[PDB]
Amino acid sequence: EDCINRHNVYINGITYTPVSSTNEKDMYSFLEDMGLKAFTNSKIRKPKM
Amino acid sequence: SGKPQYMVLVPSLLHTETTEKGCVLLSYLNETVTVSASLESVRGNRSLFTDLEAENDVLHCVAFAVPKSSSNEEVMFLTVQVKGPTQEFKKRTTVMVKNEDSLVFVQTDKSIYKPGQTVKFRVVSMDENFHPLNELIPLVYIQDPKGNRIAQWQSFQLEGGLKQFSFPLSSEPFQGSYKVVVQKKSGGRTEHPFTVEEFVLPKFEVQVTVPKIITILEEEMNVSVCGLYTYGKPVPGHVTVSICRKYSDASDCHGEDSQAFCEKFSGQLNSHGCFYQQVKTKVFQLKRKEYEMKLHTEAQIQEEGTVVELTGRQSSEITRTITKLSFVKVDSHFRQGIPFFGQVRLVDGKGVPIPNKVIFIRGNEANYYSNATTDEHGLVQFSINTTNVMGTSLTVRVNYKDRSPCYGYQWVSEEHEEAHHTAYLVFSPSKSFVHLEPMSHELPCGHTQTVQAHYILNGGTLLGLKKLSFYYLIMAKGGIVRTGTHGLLVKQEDMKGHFSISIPVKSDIAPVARLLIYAVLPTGDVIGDSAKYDVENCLANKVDLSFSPSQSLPASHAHLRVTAAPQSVCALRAVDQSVLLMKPDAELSASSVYNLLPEKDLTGFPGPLNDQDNEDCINRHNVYINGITYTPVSSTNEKDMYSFLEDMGLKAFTNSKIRKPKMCPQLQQYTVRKYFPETWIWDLVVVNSAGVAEVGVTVPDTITEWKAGAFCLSEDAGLGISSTASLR
Amino acid sequence: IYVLDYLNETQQLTPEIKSKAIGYLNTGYQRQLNYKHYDGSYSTFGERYGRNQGNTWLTAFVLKTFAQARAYIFIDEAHITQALIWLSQRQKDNGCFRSSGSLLNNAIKGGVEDEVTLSAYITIALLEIPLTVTHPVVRNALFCLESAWKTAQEGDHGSHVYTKALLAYAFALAGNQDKRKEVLKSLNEEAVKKDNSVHWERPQKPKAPVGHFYEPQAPSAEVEMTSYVLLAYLTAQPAPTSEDLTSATNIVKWITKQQNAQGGFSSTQDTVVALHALSKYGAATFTRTGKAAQV
Amino acid sequence: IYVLDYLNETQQLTPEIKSKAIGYLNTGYQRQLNYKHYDGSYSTFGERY
Ligand SMILES: *[C@@H]1O[C@H](CO)[C@@H](O[C@@H]2O[C@H](CO)[C@@H](O[C@@H]3O[C@H](CO)[C@@H](O)[C@H](O)[C@@H]3O)[C@H](O)[C@H]2NC(C)=O)[C@H](O)[C@H]1NC(C)=O
Ligand SMILES: *[C@@H]1O[C@H](CO)[C@@H](O[C@@H]2O[C@H](CO)[C@@H](O[C@@H]3O[C@H](CO)[C@@H](O)[C@H](O)[C@@H]3O)[C@H](O)[C@H]2NC(C)=O)[C@H](O)[C@H]1NC(C)=O
Ligand SMILES: *[C@@H]1O[C@H](CO)[C@@H](O)[C@H](O)[C@H]1NC(C)=O
Ligand SMILES: *[C@@H]1O[C@H](CO)[C@@H](O)[C@H](O)[C@H]1NC(C)=O
Ligand SMILES: *[C@@H]1O[C@H](CO)[C@@H](O)[C@H](O)[C@H]1NC(C)=O
Ligand SMILES: *[C@@H]1O[C@H](CO)[C@@H](O)[C@H](O)[C@H]1NC(C)=O
Ligand SMILES: *[C@@H]1O[C@H](CO)[C@@H](O)[C@H](O)[C@H]1NC(C)=O
């Protein structure tokens, strides 16, 4: 359920900019490609909005 | 210590054949500076050079002059060159020059003429500043209506800033509306209409009273009729008031009367006083389909059978929007580090404040939902601590987001206005800024005024020096007018906020008064803001008229007095106000002279010139975000200093970061003897060093108003427009 | 336009084809007007929407072409003036014009898209219009040209040919006869002279991995640069000398020998400037009045 | 065209408006050329089919 999407992205600095989906390997994906699945509370998956 | 700093400000729209001022600011080490502006006409070869010595932390303003040009309107390349003993800088842009046309106008001795009479009129000419200008005018003529021009004068030169002419109309002149037309060298033309027809002099005028604005929720209406006469004394007789609602269900063509419901009331205008009457608007059906309110009152004066009509309150606004609240001091901008307070007024219908009434202020993108109430003046000062996103939306309501009674029936005319306002935050790379708390309003004239300024300095001077500075400019008439500075021993390392500013409002300032102020930080940083003071329409050269008083009986000995500059001229138009009792004059006041002006307020750069783009493109391979995900690119939308000076109307050359670091777009692509009436006096008079005083001749059997219009002119103080002393 | 100039200068012209070309010129002119911008710039599409920004090189090309068209047919000065102020707006105090890349293909452009080369092509297009060197734009541009030529001259490589050639032409238009002869000497040093003529190519073969065919990102621009050198040699304030005319004759022989049977040359840029240079050469050498030479 | 003629015959003409009208004339002329026929006739649309 983690949806970190702000009203406006809250991109401080020189200018503002919108949101987008990333593309990078994750621990969850490591265990996925590994073949198995696991239950845990720690931050395994990426906080996909 | 820090980076050296220079800054040149100049308007965008330049006028020719006159003077225009531009300011320059200089400071910080290697001060033997020499600035030079070069205005050059690109196509062909034209060049106007100007130089000036420049020192430390001085805001000096030089007034360069520009002569006429070959073409009428044309652009030019303005290039500024700053030369310091060990530094150099050069920057240019496109300045728009215009062979502006003077502001000329006509005034007649009468508004309506009868056969056989001589039309007497005056032609006046002026420049932006209202200092009288002498000029050779190519053409001025009186035209008959068929295009059968009735009279014409060529190539005459103005000397005292004006010229009077006269033309005797015949016994059998064409009837209708005639016209005086003046043509200036620039090809410009100006029209002043006047009419010629037969008419009887009226010795009275009807004057009715009804609400200027009638709205929906109205069950009755007050009506009154009172007739002014010779010396405004009461008149006995009869009156027939026809209050009406216009544009009914009838088709309105060839057989259907456009005239909607009318109510005719008959009153006996008594000896003393005037007549009153309370009507009921139930018959008018003040609802969805029916149209506006025309009140044609017709008073019949006895012993003459003379009926006269007056068209009043045609525009009583049966407004579907009721309880139309208001705003007053609603700031257009904010900052992510400040509590901005907006003052809001709430009124309903006609314009009367509503006291002690609950309202709701909703601030979206800041989450500020609060309740308030309308006080004795219906004013509410709501403050919001701003630490939020780019744009904040603020609305205020007394009802909610829907028209409470029968909104969408397609057959209803009820509504409630909703206060709506949007505000943007300013850009601040230094995270420090200024924001003025203005008296944004109907500013008086001939008086001092104090505007307060809030400076939030995030660390202020990083290294710099101890003394920091603020420079302000009160510009007007699409130009400039006043300038000044101020500075302060900054606190060591905090954001100190309060400090006020004082400025006089003598004159030389348009209805609009655009005030801006910017503070410079030796680190190559600057901050600033604007403000709007709608100056009252008043003139520089004070002027007034008086008279040795009203006295019946033709005793010639009567006086008129005029106060103006110590060496001036004055056009005096004392008119037996009989024709003027009948028909009014044509917009003779200060507001007229002001609106005749070209481009009252300069906002935004003119059309032809587009902009002065930059090249600092910050587009990364990708926006470079580490965390939840990566982000794409997109443009921002917030106010900026460059935009402040753009909306201000001027332009400037600097080195510091003014414009927002906008990125370049994506490259990738696919016992009496009657004299002459309907007039009294029409002449020029000289003003000595103590005010002029003419002795007018009280004339017989002419009992009407006597409007005395005074139009003075002085080469030093300008023009003057003073009231209509009615020596009845 | 340049074809018309070649024919008129060589006297090989008839009124029929003249009228035909006039009609073509008017049509193409208006069609080009259908792609400008509201400010006066130009792009590939532009008009019918405002979700784009103009190009600089294209605007300069339009400017030069409209100038010659003005020389023969009637045109509106407002457009060239607007384009001029636009280019000036896209110029820097010290640096030169920026390449606001919004083109479709680089084949039409006979250059390497370098900021120096772009600025040089721009300023030469400006100077082609009768413009005083004391003018601001050309002043700043000349500063760019001087600096760029200095850095390319002291350095062993500044592209060795294209830049120096265009720079030479610009210097020739300005009036810096000394700078003209200097850069011209530098060019003559790296000669590609043949049996009965002379010319210049790109750096003899591009160094880095290049080629495969079809002129990818490198239209060869040999005819255009050679013609630019020609036009430079042919320019002087009183009238040209003799030596420059000899070298001009050499390169002209190479040019005419390089013509294409289909018509024109390898592309549009080269054909345009080549015919321009040949026209000026005819205006200088060929004379319809001089008809009694005795050798 | 007839407006130009009226102005020139009445002498009430300036070169600025003259150039403006010239541009308009050339543009409208070509736009009209965009509707002729192959034989030389004219119609409402014609060309492009
Ligand atoms: C083709 O372009 C030429 C411009 O070069 C148009 O003008 C012809 O141009 C030459 C100069 O290039 C003119 O020559 C002049 O002769 C006088 C003596 O009569 C001499 O004093 C001058 O110094 C100059 O040499 C020539 O008069 C001029 N007109 C002609 C030949 O009719 C030429 O009109 C263009 N061709 C066209 C429009 O067909
Ligand atoms: C406007 O239209 C006229 C044609 O009507 C264009 O040509 C002008 O024609 C007039 C005669 O109508 C010329 O006047 C002439 O003056 C000489 C004496 O100098 C006289 O002998 C002739 O009988 C005739 O009256 C005039 O020279 C001629 N050009 C002008 C008026 O400048 C004219 O060019 C058109 N102007 C435009 C379109 O701008
Ligand atoms: C500049 O314009 C003036 C305007 O009359 C002209 O006389 C002059 O020849 C032009 N050139 C120079 C260098 O002044
Ligand atoms: C002039 O300004 C430069 C720029 O920071 C500064 O370094 C220098 O001390 C100043 N004085 C000179 C160059 O004589
Ligand atoms: C209208 O007249 C009545 C008396 O006739 C008075 O009481 C009232 O204040 C007046 N004004 C209104 C109703 O707005
Ligand atoms: C708004 O809030 C105040 C309390 O802060 C309350 O007295 C008032 O009743 C509220 N609004 C309404 C319409 O009741
Ligand atoms: C305004 O409220 C905000 C809430 O985030 C607070 O941080 C700030 O300190 C308040 N204003 C002042 C002047 O303290």
Swiss-Prot record, chain A:
The subcellular localization recorded is: Secreted
Tissues of expression: Secreted in plasma.
Q: What domain of life does the native source organism fall in? A: Eukaryota
State the similarity comment. Belongs to the protease inhibitor I39 (alpha-2-macroglobulin) family.
Subunit-structure text: Homotetramer; disulfide-linked.
What functional role does this protein have?
A: Is able to inhibit all four classes of proteinases by a unique 'trapping' mechanism. This protein has a peptide stretch, called the 'bait region' which contains specific cleavage sites for different proteinases. When a proteinase cleaves the bait region, a conformational change is induced in the protein which traps the proteinase. The entrapped enzyme remains active against low molecular weight substrates (activity against high molecular weight substrates is greatly reduced).
- This one is known as Alpha-2-macroglobulin
Q: Origin organism of this chain?
A: Homo sapiens
What lineage does UniProt assign to this protein's organism?
Eukaryota, Metazoa, Chordata, Craniata, Vertebrata
Span covered, complete protein = 640 to 688 of 1474
